[PDB]
Amino acid sequence: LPMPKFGPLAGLRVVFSGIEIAGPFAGQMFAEWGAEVIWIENVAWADTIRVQPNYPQLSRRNLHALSLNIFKDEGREAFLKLMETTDIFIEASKGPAFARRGITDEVLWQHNPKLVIAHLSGFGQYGTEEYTNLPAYNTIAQAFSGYLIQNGDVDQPMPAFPYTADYFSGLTATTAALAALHKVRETGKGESIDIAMYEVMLRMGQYFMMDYFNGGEMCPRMSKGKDPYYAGCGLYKCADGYIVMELVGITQIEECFKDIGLAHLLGTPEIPEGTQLIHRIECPYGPLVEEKLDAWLATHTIAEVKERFAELNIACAKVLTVPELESNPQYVARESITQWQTMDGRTCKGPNIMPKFKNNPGQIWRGMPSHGMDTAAILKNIGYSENDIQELVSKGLAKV
Amino acid sequence: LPMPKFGPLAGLRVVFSGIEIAGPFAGQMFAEWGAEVIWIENVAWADTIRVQPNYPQLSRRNLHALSLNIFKDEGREAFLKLMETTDIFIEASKGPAFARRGITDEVLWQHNPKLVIAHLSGFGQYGTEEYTNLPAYNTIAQAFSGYLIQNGDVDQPMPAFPYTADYFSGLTATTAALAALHKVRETGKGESIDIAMYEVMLRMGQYFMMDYFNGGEMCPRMSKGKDPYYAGCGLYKCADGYIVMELVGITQIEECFKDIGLAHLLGTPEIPEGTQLIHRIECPYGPLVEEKLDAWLATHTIAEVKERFAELNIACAKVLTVPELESNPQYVARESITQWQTMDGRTCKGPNIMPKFKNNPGQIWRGMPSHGMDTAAILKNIGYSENDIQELVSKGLAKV
């Protein structure tokens, strides 16, 4: 298909089937970085992401849109033909739904033995009958993985937001698919990848869970955004706003304590010389440290705290609100937020390509396409005549 | 170096410099999937991850350990020699620290023009003097990207936990490095990748932020784990604990509303016939819906709710505590949590390899190595003699 040559993934052909966040995020990331990516949508039901007024202009940029019944008669034929020149196919569905519909990995590989197939589901491609075919949702994946129970406040768990598990799961699929693609270069044989959202999230939540698994205790939840184990780390309130800080290092602790009224604790058996990180539970003075830290910070502005903390080499930052990002000097200097044109000629604002590749940078070359916009071009590209396409459309098997 | 051949990344040589989570997580993921990965530590002190009693057994498995001063004299010479047979080099530092120390991308590419170099920093490799060279932390990246302000409760922001931004940033580095590796296989030209943690997290927080950038409003924070925008979605309290639910679908909404006492809202302007998903912002009876839903849930046990919701096909799950995972049938069937031996011969429990590659699965072949365990073997493998290695040790430039 016509598109500029750019990025590390120029020339790669990626196809995805899925809706909403997790699967499409995985597929579209290839498009950020130069791949030819085809978004498959159902003929009767467009991707529900399109209900949102602005997000999809970002989350579906740089894509080609195919609308095809990939499971029925000529529609299935056209889909399996497409696979013959596809490098990576990503699909998100409820367990082994593709196999139940007659599109097994084996059938995909009959059409392209080199194909890298990524299956993204809530609970995996196999397991028990009770869980395997259950719906995939971000909240459920967080609930089921131990991630949710570690988020929120001491007496109020909550999910990480927004839809954190969908992003982790999608990104993992992209990563895994690129890894499998590497192996195809050497062997000429494809791969199938079983990405279960709860397993992705299990891994992301191990920092303290590893203690529980190996004889120790699970950590508590944060109290008002303060770290559950490390004093002076996390979220604090100043006079005119919130900050985060990380009270780490020998001099940092000594100088900070001088400021807040706790110079007398330095050199004690509880906070001995050379202490570089305070554990709030193990240290009897943990609660006192927080009382004095809170009191000192509450009488100072963010600007004052940042100025002192810079003098003391204490890591910190203002908690930015969304309205403060666009004018922030680092954002401006790095063009972190940019603008592009939608397919219907309106200006859209949003994040630039990340990360920044030096030799082969990504770029935004196309706005989000409409439902079935590229169907005719795609089918022509894989050998369908104009009459064939008109016939697919008349049968209800494709939408142009 | 001696190791089993397995996984999609068998034969790939990866080296990383960094400590704690973000950089090492990026490097170690290659090792999960079969690569030869070398972990660089300093000489006279080790990676601070090692102070954790259990996590590092997971986060540093399948690794080789090199202890080498890569910036100074003959230590630098040995590092640049190692780069000649390295495919991917990952480093986490404060901005362009490697360049400041004398190791520019140009120097690296003099030794291997194919080298894929991933630079992971808080604020990027370039930008303003004020921000570019500031410390990299998870809390700071959340604060500076607008992620933190979107997490927590209505009147209490908080970070996503545990250390969510380090995991997103590290995972992105792995992904981007694999993409650049594809380009190397195609053109022979290496790459330098500027991964700024705040830009990673900017992207993960766009679902509602795109509305703010394009004329609309920002979304509020969750209330006690409930979605800020969609009614009947998120965390709820039953008689005997927490669940998550997703009130999505026509009959789901109708039958739930009848159960909870709101049948009179159906077929109205506020909840039109055929409503699939209630947008709370715009529905005048959103608070009433939450009131009635909470009252009904509070009189039923988690089991009673799951039973009814299974009848209605409403997606839901119990919020699992960490003690509930190991015996869960899906975890058992999929061997999601497994055991392996540490290098000193103890049994360690934790997550299996994820995701599950069908043809070339990952495996756990080695426990976390000790500080400088593989220094001698690595230096020997790239042409150093026993005497040359002893001289590095006496000079304080390597540890064995």
Short mmCIF file of N, CA and C in Angstrom, two decimals, chain A residues 8 52 54-55 123-128 131-132 137 139 143-145 147-152 156-159 161 163-164 171-172 175-176 181 183 185 190-194 198-199 203 206-208 210-212 214 222 224 227-228 230 235 242 244 246 315 320 322-323 328-331 334 336 348-349 351 355-356 358-360, chain B residues 5 8 20 52 54-55 106 123-124 126 128 131-132 137 139 143-145 147-152 156-161 163-164 175 178 182-183 185 190-192 194 198-199 203 206-208 210-212 214 222 227-230 235 244 246 315 320 322-323 328-331 334 336 348-349 351 355-360:
data_model
loop_
_atom_site.label_atom_id
_atom_site.label_comp_id
_atom_site.label_asym_id
_atom_site.label_seq_id
_atom_site.Cartn_x
_atom_site.Cartn_y
_atom_site.Cartn_z
N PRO A 8 12.20 2.07 12.02
CA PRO A 8 12.89 0.77 12.04
C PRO A 8 12.05 -0.35 11.45
N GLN A 52 -15.51 7.17 21.18
CA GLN A 52 -14.75 8.24 21.83
C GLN A 52 -14.37 9.35 20.82
N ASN A 54 -12.02 11.77 20.73
CA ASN A 54 -10.68 12.27 20.44
C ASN A 54 -9.60 11.19 20.55
N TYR A 55 -9.64 10.37 21.60
CA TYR A 55 -8.59 9.34 21.78
C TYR A 55 -8.23 8.55 20.52
N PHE A 123 -7.24 -14.61 30.05
CA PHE A 123 -6.85 -15.78 30.86
C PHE A 123 -5.99 -16.80 30.13
N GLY A 124 -5.68 -16.56 28.86
CA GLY A 124 -4.81 -17.47 28.12
C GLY A 124 -5.56 -18.30 27.09
N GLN A 125 -4.79 -19.01 26.27
CA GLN A 125 -5.30 -19.84 25.18
C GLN A 125 -5.72 -21.23 25.67
N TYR A 126 -5.25 -21.62 26.85
CA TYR A 126 -5.61 -22.91 27.48
C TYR A 126 -5.60 -22.77 29.00
N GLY A 127 -6.16 -23.75 29.71
CA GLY A 127 -6.24 -23.70 31.15
C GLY A 127 -7.44 -24.54 31.59
N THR A 128 -8.29 -24.02 32.46
CA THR A 128 -9.50 -24.74 32.85
C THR A 128 -10.69 -24.25 32.05
N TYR A 131 -12.26 -20.66 33.50
CA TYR A 131 -11.63 -19.34 33.29
C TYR A 131 -11.22 -19.04 31.88
N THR A 132 -10.90 -20.05 31.10
CA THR A 132 -10.20 -19.79 29.85
C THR A 132 -11.02 -18.95 28.87
N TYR A 137 -10.97 -7.98 30.43
CA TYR A 137 -11.12 -6.58 30.83
C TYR A 137 -9.93 -6.20 31.71
N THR A 139 -9.96 -4.25 34.40
CA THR A 139 -10.23 -4.39 35.82
C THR A 139 -10.09 -5.82 36.32
N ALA A 143 -7.62 -7.45 39.07
CA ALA A 143 -8.23 -8.19 40.20
C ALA A 143 -7.60 -9.56 40.34
N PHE A 144 -7.42 -10.22 39.19
CA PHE A 144 -7.06 -11.64 39.13
C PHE A 144 -5.55 -11.88 39.31
N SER A 145 -4.75 -10.83 39.11
CA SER A 145 -3.28 -10.90 39.17
C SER A 145 -2.63 -10.42 40.46
N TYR A 147 -2.62 -7.33 41.25
CA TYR A 147 -2.23 -5.94 41.01
C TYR A 147 -3.18 -4.96 41.70
N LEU A 148 -4.48 -5.23 41.62
CA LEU A 148 -5.47 -4.30 42.16
C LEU A 148 -5.30 -4.14 43.67
N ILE A 149 -5.11 -5.26 44.35
CA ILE A 149 -5.04 -5.28 45.82
C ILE A 149 -3.81 -4.53 46.34
N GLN A 150 -2.81 -4.31 45.47
CA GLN A 150 -1.66 -3.48 45.86
C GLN A 150 -1.75 -2.02 45.51
N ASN A 151 -2.80 -1.62 44.81
CA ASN A 151 -3.01 -0.22 44.49
C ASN A 151 -4.03 0.44 45.41
N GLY A 152 -4.01 1.76 45.46
CA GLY A 152 -4.90 2.52 46.30
C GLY A 152 -4.30 2.78 47.68
N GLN A 156 -8.45 1.37 51.17
CA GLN A 156 -9.26 1.43 49.97
C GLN A 156 -8.47 0.98 48.76
N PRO A 157 -8.57 -0.27 48.38
CA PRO A 157 -7.92 -0.70 47.13
C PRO A 157 -8.56 0.00 45.95
N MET A 158 -7.83 0.13 44.85
CA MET A 158 -8.36 0.61 43.61
C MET A 158 -7.49 0.18 42.46
N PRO A 159 -8.05 0.05 41.26
CA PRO A 159 -7.23 -0.26 40.07
C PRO A 159 -6.25 0.84 39.75
N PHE A 161 -4.96 3.30 36.93
CA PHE A 161 -5.78 4.00 35.97
C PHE A 161 -4.90 4.85 35.05
N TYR A 163 -6.80 2.17 32.73
CA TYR A 163 -6.82 0.94 31.95
C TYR A 163 -5.41 0.39 31.77
N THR A 164 -4.63 0.51 32.85
CA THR A 164 -3.19 0.20 32.88
C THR A 164 -2.88 -1.20 32.35
N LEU A 171 1.48 -3.78 24.95
CA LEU A 171 2.91 -3.59 24.77
C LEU A 171 3.67 -4.92 24.82
N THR A 172 3.31 -5.79 25.76
CA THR A 172 3.96 -7.08 25.85
C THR A 172 3.79 -7.88 24.55
N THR A 175 6.19 -6.59 22.02
CA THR A 175 7.53 -7.03 22.37
C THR A 175 7.79 -8.47 21.97
N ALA A 176 6.86 -9.32 22.38
CA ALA A 176 6.95 -10.76 22.11
C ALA A 176 6.90 -11.09 20.62
N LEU A 181 9.68 -12.61 15.64
CA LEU A 181 10.04 -12.20 14.30
C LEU A 181 11.53 -12.41 14.06
N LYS A 183 13.47 -14.69 15.38
CA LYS A 183 13.72 -16.11 15.23
C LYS A 183 13.35 -16.59 13.82
N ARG A 185 13.79 -15.03 11.07
CA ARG A 185 14.93 -14.76 10.16
C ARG A 185 15.87 -15.96 10.02
N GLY A 190 7.52 -19.88 11.75
CA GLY A 190 6.72 -18.97 12.54
C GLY A 190 6.55 -19.35 13.99
N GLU A 191 5.61 -18.68 14.65
CA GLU A 191 5.47 -18.84 16.09
C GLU A 191 4.07 -18.40 16.49
N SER A 192 3.62 -18.96 17.60
CA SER A 192 2.37 -18.61 18.21
C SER A 192 2.64 -18.20 19.67
N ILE A 193 2.04 -17.08 20.06
CA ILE A 193 2.34 -16.45 21.35
C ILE A 193 1.05 -16.32 22.15
N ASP A 194 1.07 -16.86 23.36
CA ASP A 194 -0.13 -16.91 24.21
C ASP A 194 0.11 -15.88 25.33
N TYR A 198 -3.57 -11.62 32.76
CA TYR A 198 -3.27 -11.79 34.19
C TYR A 198 -1.80 -12.19 34.47
N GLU A 199 -1.17 -12.91 33.55
CA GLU A 199 0.24 -13.25 33.66
C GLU A 199 1.16 -12.06 33.42
N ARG A 203 3.50 -10.45 36.67
CA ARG A 203 4.92 -10.06 36.62
C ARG A 203 5.17 -8.64 37.05
N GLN A 206 5.46 -7.94 41.13
CA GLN A 206 6.29 -8.85 41.91
C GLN A 206 7.26 -8.24 42.92
N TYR A 207 7.48 -6.93 42.90
CA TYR A 207 8.54 -6.33 43.70
C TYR A 207 8.48 -6.74 45.16
N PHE A 208 7.27 -6.73 45.73
CA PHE A 208 7.05 -7.18 47.10
C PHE A 208 6.37 -8.54 47.18
N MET A 210 7.19 -11.13 45.72
CA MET A 210 8.25 -12.12 45.85
C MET A 210 8.62 -12.45 47.29
N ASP A 211 8.41 -11.50 48.19
CA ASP A 211 8.62 -11.75 49.60
C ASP A 211 7.56 -12.70 50.11
N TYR A 212 6.32 -12.51 49.69
CA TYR A 212 5.23 -13.37 50.14
C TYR A 212 5.46 -14.80 49.68
N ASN A 214 8.17 -16.32 49.14
CA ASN A 214 9.40 -16.91 49.65
C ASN A 214 9.60 -16.67 51.14
N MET A 222 0.02 1.76 50.05
CA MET A 222 0.43 3.13 50.33
C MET A 222 -0.56 3.85 51.22
N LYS A 224 -1.86 7.56 51.52
CA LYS A 224 -1.90 8.83 50.81
C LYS A 224 -0.72 9.01 49.84
N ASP A 227 5.17 5.77 50.03
CA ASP A 227 5.64 4.41 49.84
C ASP A 227 5.30 3.57 51.07
N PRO A 228 4.89 2.33 50.89
CA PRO A 228 4.54 1.50 52.06
C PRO A 228 5.74 1.11 52.92
N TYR A 230 9.36 2.71 52.40
CA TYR A 230 10.46 3.66 52.43
C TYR A 230 9.96 5.02 52.84
N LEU A 235 4.45 10.74 47.65
CA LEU A 235 3.67 11.93 47.49
C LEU A 235 3.56 12.69 48.80
N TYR A 242 0.97 19.56 45.29
CA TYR A 242 1.62 18.28 45.60
C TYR A 242 2.98 18.17 44.93
N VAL A 244 6.31 14.98 44.55
CA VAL A 244 6.90 13.71 44.91
C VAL A 244 8.36 13.94 45.28
N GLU A 246 12.10 11.62 46.81
CA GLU A 246 12.75 10.34 47.08
C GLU A 246 13.92 10.64 47.98
N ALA A 315 16.08 14.16 45.08
CA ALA A 315 15.20 13.99 43.92
C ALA A 315 13.77 14.38 44.23
N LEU A 320 2.45 17.48 38.18
CA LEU A 320 1.82 18.30 37.18
C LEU A 320 0.35 17.89 36.92
N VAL A 322 -2.75 18.21 34.08
CA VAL A 322 -2.79 18.12 32.64
C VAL A 322 -2.59 19.49 31.93
N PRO A 323 -3.25 20.57 32.40
CA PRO A 323 -3.05 21.89 31.79
C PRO A 323 -1.62 22.44 31.84
N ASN A 328 5.38 23.26 29.52
CA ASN A 328 6.55 22.88 30.30
C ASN A 328 7.81 22.91 29.42
N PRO A 329 8.89 23.55 29.86
CA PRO A 329 10.08 23.65 29.01
C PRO A 329 10.64 22.34 28.44
N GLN A 330 10.65 21.25 29.21
CA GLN A 330 11.15 19.98 28.64
C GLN A 330 10.24 19.45 27.52
N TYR A 331 8.93 19.51 27.74
CA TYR A 331 7.98 19.16 26.71
C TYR A 331 8.16 19.99 25.41
N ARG A 334 11.52 19.11 23.51
CA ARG A 334 11.53 17.75 22.92
C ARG A 334 10.31 17.49 21.98
N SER A 336 7.32 16.95 22.73
CA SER A 336 6.72 15.75 23.29
C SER A 336 5.25 15.70 22.95
N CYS A 348 -5.38 18.03 15.04
CA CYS A 348 -5.47 17.23 16.27
C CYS A 348 -4.16 17.37 17.04
N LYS A 349 -4.25 17.57 18.35
CA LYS A 349 -3.11 17.66 19.27
C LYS A 349 -2.95 16.40 20.11
N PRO A 351 0.32 13.37 21.89
CA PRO A 351 1.73 12.97 21.96
C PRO A 351 2.36 12.69 20.63
N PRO A 355 9.42 5.85 21.48
CA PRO A 355 10.53 6.73 21.84
C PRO A 355 11.13 7.41 20.59
N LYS A 356 12.25 8.13 20.76
CA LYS A 356 12.86 8.84 19.65
C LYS A 356 14.04 8.01 19.09
N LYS A 358 17.06 7.65 16.63
CA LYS A 358 17.96 8.70 16.09
C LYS A 358 18.08 8.61 14.55
N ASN A 359 18.44 7.42 14.06
CA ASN A 359 18.66 7.18 12.61
C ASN A 359 17.36 7.08 11.80
N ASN A 360 16.37 6.38 12.36
CA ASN A 360 15.10 6.12 11.70
C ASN A 360 13.89 6.51 12.57
N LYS B 5 20.45 -23.66 24.60
CA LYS B 5 19.83 -23.00 23.47
C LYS B 5 18.30 -23.13 23.57
N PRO B 8 12.92 -17.64 21.45
CA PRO B 8 13.05 -16.88 20.20
C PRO B 8 14.36 -16.09 20.08
N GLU B 20 18.67 -1.25 39.85
CA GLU B 20 17.26 -1.22 40.30
C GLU B 20 16.33 -1.80 39.26
N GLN B 52 17.42 -6.15 48.36
CA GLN B 52 16.12 -6.83 48.49
C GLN B 52 16.31 -8.33 48.70
N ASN B 54 14.36 -11.08 48.22
CA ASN B 54 13.75 -12.09 47.35
C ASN B 54 13.55 -11.66 45.88
N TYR B 55 13.05 -10.46 45.65
CA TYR B 55 12.75 -9.98 44.28
C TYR B 55 13.90 -10.23 43.28
N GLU B 106 28.82 7.53 18.85
CA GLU B 106 29.82 7.49 17.78
C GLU B 106 30.97 6.56 18.16
N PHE B 123 14.13 12.04 31.60
CA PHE B 123 13.70 13.21 30.86
C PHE B 123 14.25 13.27 29.44
N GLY B 124 14.94 12.22 29.01
CA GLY B 124 15.46 12.17 27.66
C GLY B 124 16.94 12.48 27.55
N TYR B 126 18.19 14.78 25.41
CA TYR B 126 18.37 16.20 25.09
C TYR B 126 17.12 16.92 25.53
N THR B 128 16.11 20.72 27.79
CA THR B 128 16.61 21.93 28.48
C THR B 128 17.70 21.59 29.48
N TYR B 131 16.07 20.32 33.04
CA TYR B 131 15.45 19.02 33.25
C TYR B 131 16.23 17.83 32.74
N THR B 132 17.03 18.02 31.71
CA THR B 132 17.61 16.86 31.02
C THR B 132 18.48 15.98 31.92
N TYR B 137 13.37 8.68 38.42
CA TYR B 137 12.60 7.82 39.34
C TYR B 137 11.20 7.59 38.81
N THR B 139 8.37 7.68 40.60
CA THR B 139 7.43 8.67 41.10
C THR B 139 7.50 9.97 40.31
N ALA B 143 4.68 11.80 38.10
CA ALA B 143 4.33 13.17 38.42
C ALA B 143 4.42 14.08 37.19
N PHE B 144 5.45 13.89 36.39
CA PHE B 144 5.81 14.82 35.34
C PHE B 144 5.03 14.54 34.04
N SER B 145 4.41 13.36 33.94
CA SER B 145 3.72 12.92 32.73
C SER B 145 2.20 13.06 32.78
N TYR B 147 0.47 11.21 34.70
CA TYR B 147 -0.05 9.92 35.16
C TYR B 147 -0.51 9.92 36.63
N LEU B 148 0.27 10.54 37.48
CA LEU B 148 -0.01 10.53 38.90
C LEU B 148 -1.30 11.26 39.21
N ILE B 149 -1.51 12.40 38.57
CA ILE B 149 -2.68 13.19 38.86
C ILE B 149 -3.97 12.45 38.45
N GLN B 150 -3.87 11.42 37.62
CA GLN B 150 -5.03 10.66 37.18
C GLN B 150 -5.29 9.43 38.03
N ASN B 151 -4.35 9.07 38.89
CA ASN B 151 -4.50 7.95 39.77
C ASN B 151 -4.91 8.35 41.19
N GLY B 152 -5.47 7.42 41.95
CA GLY B 152 -5.95 7.71 43.27
C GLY B 152 -7.41 8.05 43.33
N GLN B 156 -7.57 12.60 46.66
CA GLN B 156 -6.23 12.15 47.03
C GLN B 156 -5.54 11.50 45.82
N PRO B 157 -4.75 12.25 45.09
CA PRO B 157 -3.93 11.61 44.05
C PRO B 157 -2.95 10.61 44.68
N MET B 158 -2.49 9.65 43.88
CA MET B 158 -1.43 8.76 44.32
C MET B 158 -0.80 8.12 43.08
N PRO B 159 0.43 7.66 43.18
CA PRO B 159 1.06 6.91 42.07
C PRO B 159 0.41 5.57 41.88
N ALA B 160 0.45 5.06 40.65
CA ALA B 160 0.24 3.64 40.42
C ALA B 160 1.42 2.88 41.03
N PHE B 161 1.14 1.68 41.51
CA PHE B 161 2.05 0.91 42.34
C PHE B 161 2.04 -0.56 41.87
N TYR B 163 5.75 0.80 41.40
CA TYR B 163 6.83 1.33 40.56
C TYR B 163 6.49 1.14 39.11
N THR B 164 5.21 1.34 38.82
CA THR B 164 4.63 1.11 37.50
C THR B 164 5.39 1.75 36.34
N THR B 175 11.08 -3.41 23.71
CA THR B 175 10.32 -3.36 22.47
C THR B 175 11.03 -2.57 21.38
N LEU B 178 14.18 -4.32 20.07
CA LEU B 178 13.85 -5.38 19.12
C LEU B 178 13.42 -4.84 17.75
N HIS B 182 15.44 -5.46 14.09
CA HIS B 182 14.85 -5.82 12.78
C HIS B 182 15.49 -5.00 11.65
N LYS B 183 15.64 -3.68 11.86
CA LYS B 183 16.22 -2.77 10.89
C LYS B 183 17.69 -3.09 10.62
N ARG B 185 19.01 -6.11 10.81
CA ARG B 185 19.00 -7.32 9.97
C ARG B 185 18.72 -6.98 8.52
N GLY B 190 23.04 0.24 12.77
CA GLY B 190 22.63 0.30 14.17
C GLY B 190 21.75 1.51 14.46
N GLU B 191 21.46 1.72 15.74
CA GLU B 191 20.48 2.72 16.11
C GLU B 191 20.72 3.17 17.54
N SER B 192 20.30 4.40 17.82
CA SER B 192 20.31 4.94 19.19
C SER B 192 18.89 5.37 19.56
N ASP B 194 16.21 6.94 22.30
CA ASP B 194 16.10 7.89 23.41
C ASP B 194 14.73 7.66 24.03
N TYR B 198 9.11 10.01 31.09
CA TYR B 198 7.90 10.79 31.11
C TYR B 198 7.12 10.70 29.81
N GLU B 199 7.81 10.52 28.67
CA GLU B 199 7.15 10.36 27.38
C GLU B 199 6.46 8.99 27.29
N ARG B 203 2.14 8.73 27.07
CA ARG B 203 1.36 7.90 26.15
C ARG B 203 0.38 6.97 26.89
N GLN B 206 -3.26 8.66 28.00
CA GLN B 206 -3.95 9.49 26.99
C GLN B 206 -5.44 9.27 26.81
N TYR B 207 -6.00 8.21 27.39
CA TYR B 207 -7.37 7.81 27.05
C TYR B 207 -8.34 9.00 27.23
N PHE B 208 -8.25 9.68 28.36
CA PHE B 208 -9.05 10.89 28.60
C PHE B 208 -8.28 12.17 28.31
N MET B 210 -6.60 12.99 25.86
CA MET B 210 -6.85 13.44 24.50
C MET B 210 -8.06 14.39 24.39
N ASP B 211 -9.03 14.24 25.28
CA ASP B 211 -10.17 15.16 25.32
C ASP B 211 -9.73 16.55 25.75
N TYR B 212 -8.82 16.62 26.72
CA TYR B 212 -8.31 17.90 27.18
C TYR B 212 -7.51 18.59 26.06
N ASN B 214 -7.89 18.46 22.99
CA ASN B 214 -8.67 18.75 21.82
C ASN B 214 -10.03 19.33 22.19
N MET B 222 -11.00 8.49 39.80
CA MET B 222 -11.94 7.49 40.33
C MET B 222 -12.48 7.86 41.73
N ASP B 227 -14.94 3.71 38.06
CA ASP B 227 -14.53 4.46 36.88
C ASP B 227 -15.09 5.87 36.94
N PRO B 228 -14.27 6.87 36.61
CA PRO B 228 -14.75 8.26 36.65
C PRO B 228 -15.76 8.64 35.57
N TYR B 229 -15.86 7.85 34.52
CA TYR B 229 -16.62 8.20 33.35
C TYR B 229 -17.75 7.20 33.03
N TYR B 230 -17.58 5.93 33.42
CA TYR B 230 -18.52 4.88 33.05
C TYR B 230 -19.17 4.27 34.28
N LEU B 235 -14.51 -1.07 40.86
CA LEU B 235 -14.45 -1.75 42.13
C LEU B 235 -15.74 -1.49 42.94
N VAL B 244 -14.74 -6.60 41.13
CA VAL B 244 -14.85 -5.68 40.02
C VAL B 244 -15.92 -6.16 39.07
N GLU B 246 -18.07 -4.93 35.16
CA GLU B 246 -18.15 -4.11 33.97
C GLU B 246 -19.56 -4.22 33.46
N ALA B 315 -19.76 -9.21 33.09
CA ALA B 315 -18.39 -9.51 33.46
C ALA B 315 -18.05 -9.07 34.87
N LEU B 320 -8.64 -10.65 44.13
CA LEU B 320 -7.84 -11.64 44.82
C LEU B 320 -6.76 -10.99 45.63
N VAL B 322 -3.07 -11.76 47.56
CA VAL B 322 -1.93 -12.53 47.12
C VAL B 322 -1.96 -14.00 47.60
N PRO B 323 -2.42 -14.29 48.83
CA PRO B 323 -2.56 -15.70 49.26
C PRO B 323 -3.51 -16.59 48.44
N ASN B 328 -5.35 -21.06 42.77
CA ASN B 328 -6.40 -20.77 41.82
C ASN B 328 -6.30 -21.71 40.62
N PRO B 329 -7.41 -22.31 40.20
CA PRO B 329 -7.35 -23.33 39.13
C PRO B 329 -6.65 -22.91 37.82
N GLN B 330 -6.87 -21.67 37.38
CA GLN B 330 -6.21 -21.19 36.15
C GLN B 330 -4.71 -21.09 36.36
N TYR B 331 -4.28 -20.52 37.48
CA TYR B 331 -2.85 -20.48 37.79
C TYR B 331 -2.25 -21.90 37.83
N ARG B 334 -2.03 -23.54 34.22
CA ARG B 334 -1.09 -22.86 33.33
C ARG B 334 0.30 -22.78 33.91
N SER B 336 1.41 -20.86 36.19
CA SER B 336 1.70 -19.44 36.13
C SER B 336 2.73 -19.06 37.17
N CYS B 348 13.24 -21.41 45.17
CA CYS B 348 12.67 -20.05 45.04
C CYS B 348 11.38 -20.20 44.26
N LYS B 349 10.34 -19.51 44.68
CA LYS B 349 9.08 -19.54 44.01
C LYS B 349 8.80 -18.16 43.39
N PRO B 351 6.78 -16.12 39.51
CA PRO B 351 6.21 -16.28 38.19
C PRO B 351 7.08 -17.10 37.23
N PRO B 355 5.40 -14.05 27.92
CA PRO B 355 4.23 -14.90 27.60
C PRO B 355 4.67 -16.33 27.27
N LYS B 356 3.76 -17.19 26.80
CA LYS B 356 4.09 -18.58 26.47
C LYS B 356 4.28 -18.68 24.97
N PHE B 357 5.51 -18.84 24.54
CA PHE B 357 5.79 -19.11 23.12
C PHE B 357 5.58 -20.60 22.84
N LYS B 358 4.81 -20.92 21.82
CA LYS B 358 4.47 -22.30 21.54
C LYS B 358 5.68 -23.16 21.04
N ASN B 359 6.34 -22.71 19.98
CA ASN B 359 7.44 -23.45 19.36
C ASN B 359 8.78 -23.34 20.08
N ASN B 360 9.09 -22.15 20.58
CA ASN B 360 10.32 -21.89 21.28
C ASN B 360 10.08 -21.25 22.65
#
